[PDB]
Amino acid sequence: SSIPLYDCLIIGGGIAGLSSALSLVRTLHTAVVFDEGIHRNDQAPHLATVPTWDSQDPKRFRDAAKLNILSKYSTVEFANVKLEKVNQLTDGPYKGYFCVWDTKQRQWLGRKVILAMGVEDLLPTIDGFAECWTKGIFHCLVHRGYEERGSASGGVLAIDGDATFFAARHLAFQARNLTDHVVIYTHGNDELAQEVESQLGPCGFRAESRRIEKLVQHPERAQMEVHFEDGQSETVGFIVHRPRTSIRGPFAEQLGVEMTPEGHIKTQFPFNETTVSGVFVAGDAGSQFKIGTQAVVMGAFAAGGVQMQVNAEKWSQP
């Protein structure tokens, strides 16, 4: 009766979480946005594909979004804390409601939950890769690469998730818009290299099957040195590679939401409700397209599900 009971607990203050909050304030619904401080693109030099914010800093985008909320609305609060548990209460005075705990054992109660905790990229363990990541090595040539147009050469690291001909081809064709000399690095995979040479060789694409021993990031620029197992090396203007990802936190497991084979949390059309009623997902954790515009739209629809359910629960009571 005196304990705050929020309409929604939003786990994540990234693009998805902020977008959910922005829809909820319009309908006077209450929520807490939890943000542990690390966001997937925090190391990115800019944000792309989001209207008006191209080539602008991604942290400024988040800050602008939060201020754009707090400057007018007062039903959404922001908690800069690290959550370690979320549960649907199965007993006690607030049975049926959801509860989150932070690392100091503080509690928040809510009618609904939006999971917006994002994913983390699982980087290849090639010496130097981590230091080249987001400098010379890009996850998506729509989000990066334009600034490297006219490079002497550009690379595709066709390993792990990208270790298929179709993926290598797809990424090589993107890279070809930026440079006249595309090289596909297959990192010891001779079979893939042969297929690249057979299919794309006639089109001016290079296959390189030597194992990469070290990647060296140039400080000035995107350009890197690629050092091979044989002691030789070369310079490349940039490299595209798409690491596999993993959903962050223990929350999905704790709630028992169903996962998809692709790895993201299974969603119910159209409000992205999970298999646990009253729990929704938005952003990278909730689809195979882990991009910013998807995060925005998913946040809006997740908010929609919250609004519809919370409204009905309140106003259907005489």
Ligand X SMILES: Cc1cc2nc3c(=O)[nH]c(=O)nc-3n(C[C@H](O)[C@H](O)[C@H](O)COP(=O)(O)OP(=O)(O)OC[C@H]3O[C@@H](n4cnc5c(N)ncnc54)[C@H](O)[C@@H]3O)c2cc1C
Pick from ligand X, a second copy, none: which does 290 bind, CB < 5 to 8 A by kind? ligand X
Among ligand X, a second copy, none, partner that 191 touches (CB below 5 to 8 angstroms by kind): none
Establish if 291 lies at the interface with ligand X (CB under 6 A).
Answer: yes
**Burial class for 124, CB neighbours closer than 10 Å (0-12, 13-18, 19+):** middle
What minimum distance in Å lies between the beta carbon of 165 and ligand X?
25
- Tell me the sheet residues that pair with 32: 9, 77
For ligand X, the binding residues in 76-95 under the rule CB under 6 A are: 82-83
Residue 39 contact partner, candidates a second copy, ligand X, none, CB within 5 to 8 A by sort of partner: ligand X
Q: How far apart are alpha carbons 192 and 159 in whole angstroms?
A: 10
Pick what 226 binds: ligand X, a second copy, none; C-beta below 5 to 8 Å, kind-dependent. none
E runs forming strands in 129-223: 137-138, 154-157, 182-185, 206-208, 212-217
Least Å distance, CB 310 to ligand X, is: 21
12 binds ligand X (CB under 6 A): yes
Of 6, 8, 10, 17, which lies in the binding site for ligand X, with binding defined by CB under 6 A?
Answer: 17
Residue of 7, 35, 148, 208 that binds ligand X (CB under 6 A): 35
Question: What DSSP designation does 260 have?
Answer: P
Could you say which DSSP state residue 68 is in?
A: H
On whether the CB atoms of residues 100 and 31 are closer than 8 A, the answer is no
For residue 286, give the nearest of 309, 269, 311 by alpha carbon. Answer: 269
* Smallest separation, CB 39 to a second copy (Å): 14
Q: Could you say which of a second copy, ligand X, none residue 116 binds, taking C-beta under 5 to 8 angstroms by partner kind? A: ligand X
- Which of a second copy, ligand X, none does 280 bind, CB closer than 5 to 8 A by kind? none
Binding residues for ligand X, how many (CB under 6 A)? 40
Q: Which two tokens stand for residue 18?
A: 């902020």
> Please, which residue, 91 or 262, has the CB nearer to a second copy?
262
Q: State yes or no: residue 241 binds ligand X (CB under 6 A).
A: no
Q: Which of 252, 2, 4 is nearest to 113 (CA)?
A: 252
Using only C-alpha atoms, the chain has a radius of gyration, in whole angstroms, of 23
The footprint of ligand X on residues 115-174 (CB under 6 A) is 116-118, 121, 134, 139, 143
User: Which of a second copy, ligand X, none does residue 38 bind to, with CB < 5 to 8 Å depending on kind?
Assistant: ligand X
Euclidean distance between CA atoms 234 and 31, whole angstroms: 53
Per-residue CA distances from 112 to 3, 29, 263 (Å): 16, 11, 23
User: Rule CB under 6 A: is residue 24 a binding residue for ligand X?
Assistant: no
Does 14 bind ligand X (CB under 6 A)? Our answer is: yes
From 32-40, 105-113, 199-207, 308-316, span contacting ligand X (CB under 6 A): 32-40
Give the dihedral sign, CA 135/139/144/145.
positive
- Decide whether 17 or 278 has the Cβ nearer to ligand X: 17
Neighbouring residues of 86: CB distance < 8 A, sequence distance ≥ 6: 9, 11, 98, 99, 100, 101, 113, 251, 254, 255
How near is the Cβ of 236 to a second copy at its closest, in Å?
19
Do the Cβ atoms of 283 and 118 come closer than 8 Å? yes
Q: Please say which residue, 38 or 312, places its beta carbon nearer to a second copy.
A: 312
Q: Which residues make up the interface to ligand X (CB under 6 A)?
A: 11-17, 34-41, 43-44, 47-50, 82-83, 116-118, 121, 134, 139, 143, 248-249, 283-285, 290-293, 295
